[PDB]
Amino acid sequence: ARRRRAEVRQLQPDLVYGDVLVTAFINKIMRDGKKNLAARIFYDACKIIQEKTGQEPLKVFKQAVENVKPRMEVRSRRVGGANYQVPMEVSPRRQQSLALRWLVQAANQRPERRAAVRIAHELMDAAEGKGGAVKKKEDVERMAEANRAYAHYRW
Amino acid sequence: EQYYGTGRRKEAVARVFLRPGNGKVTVNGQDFNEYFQGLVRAVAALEPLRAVDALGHFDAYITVRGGGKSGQIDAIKLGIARALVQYNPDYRAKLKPLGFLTRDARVVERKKYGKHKARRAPQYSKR
Amino acid sequence: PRSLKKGVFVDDHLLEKVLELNAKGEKRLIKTWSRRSTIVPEMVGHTIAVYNGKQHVPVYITENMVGHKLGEFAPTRTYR
Amino acid sequence: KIRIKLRGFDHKTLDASAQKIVEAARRSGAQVSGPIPLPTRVRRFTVIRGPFKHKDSREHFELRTHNRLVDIINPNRKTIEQLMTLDLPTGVEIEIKT
Amino acid sequence: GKGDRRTRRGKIWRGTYGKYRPRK
Amino acid sequence: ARKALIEKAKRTPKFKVRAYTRCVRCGRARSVYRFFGLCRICLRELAHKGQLPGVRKASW
Amino acid sequence: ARIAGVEIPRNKRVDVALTYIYGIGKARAKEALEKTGINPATRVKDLTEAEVVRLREYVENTWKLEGELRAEVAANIKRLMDIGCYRGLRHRRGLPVRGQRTRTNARTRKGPRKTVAG
RNA sequence: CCGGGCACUCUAACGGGACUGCCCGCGAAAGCGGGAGGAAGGAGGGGACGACGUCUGGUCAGCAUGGCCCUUACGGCCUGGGCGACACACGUGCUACAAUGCCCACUACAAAGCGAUGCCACCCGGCAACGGGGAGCUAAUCGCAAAAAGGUGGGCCCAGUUCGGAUUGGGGUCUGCAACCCGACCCCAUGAAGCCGGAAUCGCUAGUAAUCGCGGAUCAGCCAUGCCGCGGUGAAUACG
Ligand SMILES: [Mg+2]
Ligand SMILES: [Mg+2]
Ligand SMILES: [Mg+2]
Ligand SMILES: [Mg+2]
Ligand SMILES: [Mg+2]
Ligand SMILES: [Mg+2]
Ligand SMILES: [Mg+2]
Ligand SMILES: [Mg+2]
Ligand SMILES: [Mg+2]
Ligand SMILES: [Mg+2]
Ligand SMILES: [Mg+2]
Ligand SMILES: [Mg+2]
Ligand SMILES: [Mg+2]
Ligand SMILES: [Mg+2]
Ligand SMILES: [Mg+2]
Ligand SMILES: [Mg+2]
Ligand SMILES: [Mg+2]
Ligand SMILES: [Mg+2]
Ligand SMILES: [Mg+2]
Ligand SMILES: [Mg+2]
Ligand SMILES: [Mg+2]
Ligand SMILES: [Mg+2]
Ligand SMILES: [Mg+2]
Ligand SMILES: [Mg+2]
Ligand SMILES: [Mg+2]
Ligand SMILES: [Mg+2]
Ligand SMILES: [Mg+2]
Ligand SMILES: [Mg+2]
Ligand SMILES: [Mg+2]
Ligand SMILES: [Mg+2]
Ligand SMILES: [Mg+2]
Ligand SMILES: [Mg+2]
Ligand SMILES: [Mg+2]
Ligand SMILES: [Mg+2]
Ligand SMILES: [Mg+2]
Ligand SMILES: [Mg+2]
Ligand SMILES: [Zn+2]
């Protein structure tokens, strides 16, 4: 985006929960443009999370997404030769895409055979503070506060 | 007695004949859910009725031909919204913020010579 | 996987030539530019010079090689 | 049953040829079916723009055959009266079947 | 996949017919 | 191409399979459209000239 | 369960388990399971010996199989190798036979790459 | 399907429609921000269209052409071979390494094109490629035709496998005078590498990328996974 601000895409509210964060998470599950398959994954994964746990899958989905949001991260910036890992805050929009992408990526690193099993189990572990996605988040905030010595290169 | 709108989306048409009744919907001589239902997005086509709470008022007999089934669902959505305004023109002010009466002008972009599929450029090496 | 399906093809050049050589007993080398043709039982025991495009190569024709074509035994390429 | 099949590469020639035929047959015959338009057969030719490659520069052309139908219903004479040889259009081409 | 000719999908990928993809 | 290679016209080819297209105008061997009997290069030159009826510029 | 010359598939569906025999693919196993009237879906461990003997009976002498096949194929090479056949020449030097290109991509037949200088 | 009708879908010809025209704010103006109405808005989306000139760019092998050479030969005919060679190297692609998957049965929704000895419904033979017979169509009327992903049901259960389809043996169909070099296709058997790829590097900003099939040009046939088009499903992201 050199000219404009590159406005954000406004996604369709969910057919089931009427929530836009659901659809956005469904889209990250989708591959090769099979949105019908990707929805049946997520919704069948909502049956799993709501049976094995007596709670509402909507609230666990959000509570999981929240625990994976990183408050800071590191970027590179060319300064006097070789560049540096520079810690800086994360836009509230970027906390969206990162937490969602991480959850889907983590769940597919999982042992479980079927897809919806892995989604539900990940969401549950993530909402409890463990699981693969929260590791990528706790490891990123570790990059910052380690390179905290370059907080003057904010940019 | 009866109200109608055309509706169109991405090379697909669905004639929507709205008739006051129990609330059962027929599509191509089949149940609404014998045609769809294996398709999650199907219930979107009936969102015009839910916006005005017209679920239990009307039956619907629909003829859909052309395109694939997902565009057929959007074409129904429009035909349902179009007939819905011909019934009561006061339903424009309610249906319009949601944009159900807007046609979706997005169609498959034409393939172009020298590319692979109309935007995707053949990959090169330079060495 | 090789198929001619019926009327197994053999050129008329050598066909009338070979069957007439049998009535007079086995002859010496024979000139052939038609490798199009297959091999039939009545060739066994003769010798036939098939063309490479460059040279004529004598080919002793035996029982085991009936089913094939001339030029299967007259290779074209020259490598190493 | 009188079928009249109009075909031509120019859509202005057909309409100029069809409209002239209805104006002769409407003075005599019944309400004619009318100039019903049949779909077009579009042959396309893609050709590389120059000689001797630059494969990726082709320009293409199309040649379109538009079709029309006439169908006079119950015509006897004063229809066929003006229908022997009065037409102007050249690039048009007409066939008749019964 | 599309490479196995004696699978159905490998038949439609080549546009052919046979035992592993009849006509009707 | 070569004058002697326009023996296609005289075919009597001794085998049907030896009949080939041979663009009439320029004597092109390689790329000959069968409907105009012209090569792709002759086709393009005659199109621009306007001597092919009904052949427009394609655009869509 | 020993079906052919020594051949022991186990614990899987029988049709898929016969594939572990040399001269048997999916086509021949589906045929034996048919002409012998045996449910294909049964596990090998659950096989009746009365069905196992019926299978051995068919398969063993209906088609030539593991030991003989390898010999027959190998003898079918020597045959077109011992005659001057071109096909036999391509078999000698270890090159493709079906008329493929060798300038690249001979790898399966040609013993993966052995590089030289330039 | 018939009677019947043009309302609807559609087909294909002519028109209407959008102009910062209207409201608020800023501005000297041009314009920018936002709002209503509207199918559509600030260039609505996509094409055709590429300035004075540059690179002594590319092509005398499409054609034209100055000059120079050849003229029982650099020309001409034919049969055969080669353009397909293989110890290697790069480019462009295809198919994959799998469970968001593979296979089997059942079932549903496209657009754009092609076809008179050609497309070939349908019937019989054949596991099949295909053969015999034969209907219709100068084709919005008949045919290629089946779209595929998709959906419902079942099988596979994480394994070089029911992943993958290379290689190779064997049997056969068709085109063609003729498939040895050197064709595609069908059937049986064989079932390799490959368990997401080092340095490096490529494409796309929305019906886009990714994925899924469909058709066509040349052509008897076809080494087309190429090319040019067609529609189905349909994202991520742009602080700067
Ligand atoms: Mg530097
Ligand atoms: Mg640096
Ligand atoms: Mg660095
Ligand atoms: Mg650094
Ligand atoms: Mg597409
Ligand atoms: Mg288009
Ligand atoms: Mg290219
Ligand atoms: Mg090209
Ligand atoms: Mg260009
Ligand atoms: Mg397979
Ligand atoms: Mg010349
Ligand atoms: Mg030819
Ligand atoms: Mg000439
Ligand atoms: Mg525009
Ligand atoms: Mg424009
Ligand atoms: Mg425009
Ligand atoms: Mg130069
Ligand atoms: Mg120049
Ligand atoms: Mg000229
Ligand atoms: Mg070449
Ligand atoms: Mg060498
Ligand atoms: Mg050497
Ligand atoms: Mg049919
Ligand atoms: Mg049959
Ligand atoms: Mg008609
Ligand atoms: Mg009709
Ligand atoms: Mg007609
Ligand atoms: Mg299933
Ligand atoms: Mg291995
Ligand atoms: Mg396997
Ligand atoms: Mg594996
Ligand atoms: Mg752009
Ligand atoms: Mg073809
Ligand atoms: Mg080949
Ligand atoms: Mg092809
Ligand atoms: Mg194709
Ligand atoms: Zn020409």
Side-chain angles (χ1 to χ4, degrees), chain A residues 74-137:
Chain A
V74 121
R75 309 183 192 180
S76 296
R77 181 181 165 187
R78 239 271 200 184
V79 176
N83 17 324
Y84 279 158
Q85 299 286 74
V86 185
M88 62 192 68
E89 285 182 317
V90 187
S91 161
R93 153 66 162 180
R94 190 170 160 78
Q95 307 187 11
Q96 179 86 332
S97 314
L98 280 186
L100 285 189
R101 187 182 315 137
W102 287 340
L103 287 162
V104 184
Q105 292 187 345
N108 286 355
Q109 276 291 280
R110 258 193 178 278
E112 351 271 329
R113 297 266 164 100
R114 302 128 65 179
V117 182
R118 306 194 303 276
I119 307 301
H121 275 247
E122 184 61 67
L123 283 157
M124 296 188 296
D125 275 10
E128 289 187 314
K130 51 196 179 175
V134 200
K135 250 280 276 72
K136 298 193 182 191
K137 165 257 195 181

Side-chain angles (χ1 to χ4, degrees), chain E residues 3-24:
Chain E
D4 203 343
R5 357 209 309 191
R6 59 170 86 192
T7 58
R8 169 155 247 155
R9 186 172 301 172
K11 223 75 173 173
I12 74 190
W13 185 81
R14 291 185 158 209
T16 59
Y17 292 109
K19 184 180 80 172
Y20 297 95
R21 184 211 177 184
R23 309 208 188 194
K24 206 99 282 175

Side-chain angles (χ1 to χ4, degrees), chain A residues 8-155:
Chain A
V8 187
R9 286 193 178 274
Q10 239 64 11
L11 301 95
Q12 291 287 326
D14 189 26
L15 304 312
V16 172
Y17 289 168
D19 165 59
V20 304
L21 181 53
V22 164
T23 307
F25 183 80
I26 300 181
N27 291 351
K28 280 290 189 189
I29 298 184
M30 172 171 42
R31 49 188 53 169
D32 302 324
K34 329 181 75 173
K35 196 145 57 59
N36 195 63
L37 167 65
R40 266 205 283 90
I41 293 187
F42 179 72
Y43 290 144
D44 277 64
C46 284
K47 322 186 196 311
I48 301 183
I49 188 170
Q50 186 264 340
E51 296 165 60
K52 201 170 295 181
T53 308
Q55 300 174 358
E56 297 181 358
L58 168 72
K59 183 190 178 303
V60 194
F61 169 79
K62 313 247 194 183
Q63 171 77 318
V65 151
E66 189 45 51
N67 302 12
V68 204
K69 279 197 166 190
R71 34 195 178 281
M72 262 171 304
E73 61 152 347
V74 121
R75 309 183 192 180
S76 296
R77 181 181 165 187
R78 239 271 200 184
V79 176
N83 17 324
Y84 279 158
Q85 299 286 74
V86 185
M88 62 192 68
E89 285 182 317
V90 187
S91 161
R93 153 66 162 180
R94 190 170 160 78
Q95 307 187 11
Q96 179 86 332
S97 314
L98 280 186
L100 285 189
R101 187 182 315 137
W102 287 340
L103 287 162
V104 184
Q105 292 187 345
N108 286 355
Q109 276 291 280
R110 258 193 178 278
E112 351 271 329
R113 297 266 164 100
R114 302 128 65 179
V117 182
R118 306 194 303 276
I119 307 301
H121 275 247
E122 184 61 67
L123 283 157
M124 296 188 296
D125 275 10
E128 289 187 314
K130 51 196 179 175
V134 200
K135 250 280 276 72
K136 298 193 182 191
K137 165 257 195 181
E138 294 166 10
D139 282 339
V140 165
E141 303 171 346
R142 277 190 179 207
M143 286 303 301
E145 313 277 17
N147 297 117
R148 231 290 249 198
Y150 309 135
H152 54 291
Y153 299 138
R154 289 303 184 184
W155 191 10

Side-chain angles (χ1 to χ4, degrees), chain C:
Chain C
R2 47 179 72 183
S3 39
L4 327 177
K5 328 141 243 187
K6 69 192 55 70
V8 168
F9 189 86
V10 171
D11 289 29
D12 310 21
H13 310 145
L14 34 56
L15 198 57
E16 69 170 323
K17 192 174 303 179
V18 61
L19 65 90
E20 283 175 327
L21 289 178
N22 293 3
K24 286 78 201 170
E26 313 268 11
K27 200 215 171 180
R28 276 65 219 161
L29 319 164
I30 242 57
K31 52 167 108 182
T32 295
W33 287 274
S34 57
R35 38 207 295 162
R36 311 304 179 184
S37 41
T38 349
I39 303 175
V40 297
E42 41 269 27
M43 300 180 185
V44 183
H46 291 284
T47 326
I48 296 177
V50 198
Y51 202 52
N52 310 325
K54 174 176 192 312
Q55 227 190 122
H56 276 305
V57 277
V59 191
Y60 193 26
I61 157 69
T62 335
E63 174 73 35
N64 34 59
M65 48 178 67
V66 168
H68 304 266
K69 317 234 178 185
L70 304 97
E72 294 231 51
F73 306 86
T76 283
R77 265 55 171 235
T78 309
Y79 177 39
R80 163 194 171 272

